[PDB]
Design an enzyme around this catalytic site. Structure first.
Site, mmCIF file in Angstrom:
data_model
loop_
_atom_site.group_PDB
_atom_site.id
_atom_site.type_symbol
_atom_site.label_atom_id
_atom_site.label_comp_id
_atom_site.label_asym_id
_atom_site.label_seq_id
_atom_site.Cartn_x
_atom_site.Cartn_y
_atom_site.Cartn_z
ATOM 1 N N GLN A 229 -16.956 52.501 2.611
ATOM 2 C CA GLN A 229 -16.549 51.688 1.472
ATOM 3 C C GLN A 229 -16.893 52.377 0.150
ATOM 4 O OE1 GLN A 229 -19.081 49.742 3.719
ATOM 5 N NE2 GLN A 229 -18.109 47.699 3.880
ATOM 6 N N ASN B 177 -12.507 54.268 3.704
ATOM 7 C CA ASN B 177 -11.577 53.904 2.630
ATOM 8 C C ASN B 177 -11.595 54.865 1.445
ATOM 9 O OD1 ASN B 177 -10.854 51.557 3.960
ATOM 10 N ND2 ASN B 177 -12.246 50.275 2.722
ATOM 11 N N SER C 46 -6.381 47.331 6.467
ATOM 12 C CA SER C 46 -6.170 48.785 6.693
ATOM 13 C C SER C 46 -4.876 49.247 7.336
ATOM 14 C CB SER C 46 -7.291 49.377 7.532
ATOM 15 O OG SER C 46 -8.472 49.233 6.780
ATOM 16 N N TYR D 241 -14.139 57.494 9.639
ATOM 17 C CA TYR D 241 -13.188 56.558 9.040
ATOM 18 C C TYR D 241 -13.733 55.985 7.736
ATOM 19 C CZ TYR D 241 -9.924 52.615 8.720
ATOM 20 O OH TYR D 241 -8.969 51.710 8.316
HETATM 21 B B1 SM4 Z 1 -9.837 48.363 7.351
HETATM 22 O O1 SM4 Z 1 -8.985 47.166 7.755
HETATM 23 O O2 SM4 Z 1 -10.269 49.354 8.452
HETATM 24 C C1 SM4 Z 1 -10.702 48.257 6.009
HETATM 25 N N1 SM4 Z 1 -10.442 47.055 5.240
HETATM 26 C C2 SM4 Z 1 -11.111 46.805 4.122
HETATM 27 O O3 SM4 Z 1 -11.964 47.547 3.629
HETATM 28 C C3 SM4 Z 1 -10.732 45.511 3.472
HETATM 29 C C4 SM4 Z 1 -11.857 44.521 3.493
HETATM 30 C C5 SM4 Z 1 -12.405 43.710 2.512
HETATM 31 C C6 SM4 Z 1 -13.440 42.915 3.007
HETATM 32 C C7 SM4 Z 1 -13.750 43.044 4.353
HETATM 33 S S1 SM4 Z 1 -12.669 44.228 4.991
HETATM 34 C C8 SM4 Z 1 -12.064 48.196 6.523
HETATM 35 C C9 SM4 Z 1 -12.458 47.165 7.382
HETATM 36 C C10 SM4 Z 1 -13.770 47.163 7.864
HETATM 37 C C11 SM4 Z 1 -14.306 46.130 8.773
HETATM 38 C C12 SM4 Z 1 -13.616 45.079 9.219
HETATM 39 C C13 SM4 Z 1 -14.317 44.091 10.061
HETATM 40 O O4 SM4 Z 1 -15.562 44.022 10.038
HETATM 41 O O5 SM4 Z 1 -13.658 43.336 10.787
HETATM 42 C C14 SM4 Z 1 -14.641 48.173 7.491
HETATM 43 C C15 SM4 Z 1 -14.219 49.187 6.650
HETATM 44 C C16 SM4 Z 1 -12.927 49.211 6.160
#
Ligand code: SM4
Length: 358
Positions: A117, A149, A61, A147
């Site tokens: 995710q 992705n 990250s 927070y």
């Molecule tokens: B950051 O560094 O904040 C991010 N990364 C990603 O997604 C890539 C991967 C593939 C497989 C496993 S990891 C994140 C991280 C986390 C946790 C860590 C530990 O447990 O150490 C969560 C969410 C996003």
């Protein structure tokens, strides 16, 4: 290195590597804008390949900082605005939950509880569309930070759409190449594989798996030297000759939201310096870092504050990274390891090193 830097680094990292059982590690200290490098242990245990200044590590990250700066550069180019609705760049997002969700919310994890995710079963562009169409926000936009992705990942995909370039080409052309990050990769070329460390998870050698929005959220691999250079560029954007890039770096360190004593930038996160070490150390811990928290809007955002501790932790299954810098002290650190060890241990070591030198 000045013996002072040598001594704090070794006195701090040696114990860290021992306690955490880290196979290999590279550290760079930026001190008065000059880099000093340190390496330990193994890039590849099996083949007895040492960590060197040329070893590539998965940033995980920490890649979000490149995404945030690339997004800032697009803003500066007049290609996108953070105030633009998400739907402006993806008109196919027609589900009504998207009404009022802007690029800003995506960039800063404030869209309303986009998940941490993207699920594994999401692969194609049509899978991804269905995923966001079906997503039900927990919260109104701009009220809570979670927070994710899937939040900043999408910002990265959309931010590059007007440019006509793929995310990788935009990143290469607009960020890596201008900053001479010549050993920084979204996809590691065959010629560079000799330098690509293995990550270690449960003592198994591992590399990051392909995933939707991987490039945008967690897919950059870099050397301690390039990452030192990244830190220097972010410490002093005014030395950068490319106008939109200088501006983009500045935009990624503006303060958009506050939660506790932390401020959300574009990928970077920031606290006022001097920071309370317990506030960053405990703050880096995953279920503070990854928790749902109400945010206060900073209206309008505060431009990059020089007296800040600017940072980002990053992980993949087999790697743990950390970058932190203080613009007003021309001081910074990069810690790259091929084990994912606990964030507080990272911030603790970084704090000990930078406080000693500050
Ligand atoms: B950051 O560094 O904040 C991010 N990364 C990603 O997604 C890539 C991967 C593939 C497989 C496993 S990891 C994140 C991280 C986390 C946790 C860590 C530990 O447990 O150490 C969560 C969410 C996003």
């Amino acid at each position: 290195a000045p013996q002072q830097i040598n001594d704090i680094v070794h006195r701090t990292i040696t114990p860290l590597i021992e306690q955490q059982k880290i196979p290999g590690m590279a550290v760079a200290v930026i001190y008065q804008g000059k880099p000093y490098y340190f390496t330990w242990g193994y890039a590849d245990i099996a083949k007895k390949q040492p960590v060197t200044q040329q070893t590539l590590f998965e940033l995980g990250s920490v890649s979000k900082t490149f995404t945030g700066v690339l997004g800032g550069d697009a803003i500066a180019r007049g290609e996108i605005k953070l105030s633009d609705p998400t739907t402006k760049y993806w008109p196919e997002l027609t589900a009504k939950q998207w009404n009022g969700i802007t690029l800003l919310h995506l960039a800063t994890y404030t869209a309303g509880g986009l998940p941490l995710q993207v699920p594994d079963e999401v692969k194609s562009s049509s899978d991804l569309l269905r995923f966001y169409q079906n997503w039900q926000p927990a919260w109104a936009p701009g009220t809570q930070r979670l927070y994710a992705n899937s939040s900043i990942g999408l910002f990265g995909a959309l931010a590059v759409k007007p440019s006509g370039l793929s995310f990788e080409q935009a990143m290469q052309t607009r960020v890596f190449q201008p900053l001479k990050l010549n050993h920084t990769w979204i996809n590691v070329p065959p010629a560079e594989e000799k330098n690509y460390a293995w990550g270690y998870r449960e003592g198994k050698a591992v590399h990051v798996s392909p995933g939707a929005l991987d490039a945008e959220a967690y897919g950059v691999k870099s050397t301690i030297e390039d990452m030192a250079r990244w830190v220097q560029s972010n410490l002093k954007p005014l030395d950068i000759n490319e106008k939109t890039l200088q501006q983009g770096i500045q935009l990624a360190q503006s303060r958009y939201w506050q939660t506790g004593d932390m401020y959300q930038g574009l990928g970077w996160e920031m606290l006022d310096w001097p920071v309370n070490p317990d506030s960053i150390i405990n703050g880096s811990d995953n279920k503070i870092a990854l928790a749902a928290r109400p945010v206060k809007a900073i209206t309008p955002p505060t431009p990059a504050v020089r007296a800040s501790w600017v940072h980002k932790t990053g992980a993949t299954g087999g790697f743990g990274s950390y970058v932190a810098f203080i613009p007003e002290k021309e001081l910074g650190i990069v810690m790259l390891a091929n084990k994912n060890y606990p964030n507080p241990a990272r911030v603790d070591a970084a704090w000990q090193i930078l406080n000693a030198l500050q």
